[PDB]
């Protein structure tokens, strides 16, 4: 006999994210075999962990994947990156590209620096991560009072620096209208501890490539659409 | 991914979904 039904108040509604399927109109069809394929990946996090380039500003305000250093120790940081997946600095990194499609993140961030100067060039940098609350570090004295690692040049070319996940909340926002304590987490500044030093016949300026990616315990969640824009 | 229904699909698996097959 027919079953009595109570039509809910949302009849006919199309839920773009309902966790259910719809009617198949061309079933019993074989999906063209692709067993020969390679390169498949199943988690978008894989992408977030691939170190990608940061956009630094050239002397002519042009965007370049590195910063310069020479035979001197500035009283100010060579570069300053605000730790937000919203930083214009990492706007075109795979990390940010993926994060733009998610609401929150959690975990470590890896800032990879690759020294491209000559083999004869030496020097030491102090990479610091300053948590918020007391503002951006104004001096080396302040920067070294927070989380930091000293990078010494030599045989190995790069330094993998991790910005520890230090937050009042378990998750942090990927973007924001105005900075809040849940969307902005401090700064990463790299200072010149000792001047880049070298012999004669070597260009005064050395270029350090800069990249970012999510660390080992980095995660993103809540799929969303980012603010649309016109390509150019 | 986004499969959150307790009861099994009303349509056969061969009809609801494309049939995956290996050529080897």
């Amino acid at each position: 006999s027919p079953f009595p039904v109570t039509v809910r108040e949302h009849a006919g509604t199309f839920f773009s994210t309902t966790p259910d399927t719809t009617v198949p109109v061309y079933g019993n069809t074989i999906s063209t075999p692709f067993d020969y394929m390679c390169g498949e990946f199943t988690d978008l996090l894989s992408l977030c962990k691939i170190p990608t380039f940061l956009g630094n500003l050239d002397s002519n305000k042009k965007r370049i994947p590195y910063f310069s250093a020479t035979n001197s120790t500035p009283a100010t940081p060579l570069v300053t990156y605000q730790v937000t997946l919203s930083c214009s600095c990492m706007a075109n990194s795979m990390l940010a590209a993926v994060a733009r499609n998610f609401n929150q993140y959690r975990g470590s961030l890896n800032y990879l620096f690759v020294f491209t100067g000559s083999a004869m060039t030496k020097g030491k940098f102090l990479i610091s991560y300053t948590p918020p609350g007391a503002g951006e570090p104004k001096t080396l004295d302040q920067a070294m009072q927070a989380t930091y690692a000293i990078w010494d040049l030599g045989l190995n070319s790069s330094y993998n620096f991790t910005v520890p996940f230090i937050s009042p909340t378990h998750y942090r926002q990927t973007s924001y209208n105005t900075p809040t304590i849940t969307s902005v987490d401090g700064w990463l500044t790299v200072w010149q501890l000792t001047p880049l030093t070298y012999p004669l016949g070597v260009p005064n300026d050395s270029h350090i490539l800069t990249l970012v990616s999510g660390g080992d315990d980095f995660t993103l969640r809540m799929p969303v659409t980012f603010t649309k824009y016109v390509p150019q | 991914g986004n499969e959150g229904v307790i009861i099994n699909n009303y349509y056969s698996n061969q009809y609801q979904n494309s049939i995956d097959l290996s050529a080897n």
């Binding site: 773009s16 978008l44 991790t162 | -």
Partner: protein, 252 residues
């Protein structure tokens, strides 16, 4: 700690490597490719000014055809093609404004975020009428690369689109809810579809439009009956291959 990026890969560290810290990992799986793409996103729009019981005839009106090419990539009438074909670039609808809408159809979310070279999946399509006037429409689904069959009616006063064995849908009446949804299997003769670019030609005399793969779609949707309908795509059992760059975003 130190490393060498020239190797092609460096370790994925957490705070414990260099400092006195602990891993802080929490389980999460909303980043899985299948889950991420398993949701409906606006991907096309369709428009018809002819009734159900009439002969379907390809038409365009202010950049809207009465048929669609099922592909997340940009599609539109190309060089006066009879039906929409896959495009290689996006253009503004207006010749002046330099602002969207675009004249080309696509899943903006897919184009703006497709960090892979190839993809495989089934397609859940949703078609919705843009106004509340009672619907009365017939839609014909044509598998990837199959004959469009834009023929005359074989019988008077019947929807020519329904005059087929191809999967077709017919919705009409005040009992309906002005929409249609269904899922189709991957039908392309290709094993996997190119998600962005196809570095080659589709014919043996290499005269086709370089950059477009042959039969890289999920078929087409022809519609007849009055109205404008928006289309959504939902990628079922989505699988992607070969990581690649995302669309560049202007520097803030």
């Amino acid at each position: 700690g130190v490393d060498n990026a020239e190797k092609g890969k460096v370790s994925d560290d957490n705070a414990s490597t260099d400092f006195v810290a602990e891993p802080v990992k929490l389980p999460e799986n909303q980043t899985r490719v299948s889950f991420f793409y398993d949701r409906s996103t606006l991907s096309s729009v369709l428009q018809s000014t002819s009734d159900v019981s009439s002969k379907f005839t390809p038409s365009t009106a202010k950049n809207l055809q009465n048929s669609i090419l099922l592909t997340p990539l940009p599609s539109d009438i190309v060089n006066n093609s009879v039906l929409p074909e896959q495009e290689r670039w996006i253009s503004f609808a207006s010749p002046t404004t330099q602002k969207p809408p675009y004249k080309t159809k696509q899943d903006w979310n897919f184009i703006m975020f497709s960090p892979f070279t190839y993809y495989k999946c089934d397609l859940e399509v949703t078609l919705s009428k843009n106004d509340r006037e009672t619907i009365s429409s017939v839609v014909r689904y044509v598998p990837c690369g199959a004959p469009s069959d834009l023929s005359d009616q074989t019988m008077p006063q019947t929807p020519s689109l329904a005059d087929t064995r191809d999967p077709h849908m017919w919705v009409v009446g005040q009992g309906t809810t002005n929409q249609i949804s269904f899922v189709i299997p991957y039908t392309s003769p290709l094993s996997v579809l190119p998600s962005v670019w196809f570095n080659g030609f589709s014919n043996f005399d290499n005269s086709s439009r370089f950059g477009v793969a042959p039969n890289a779609d999920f078929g087409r949707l022809l519609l007849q009956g009055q109205g404008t309908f928006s289309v959504h795509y939902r990628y079922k059992k989505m699988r992607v291959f070969c990581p690649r760059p995302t669309v560049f975003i202007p520097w803030p």
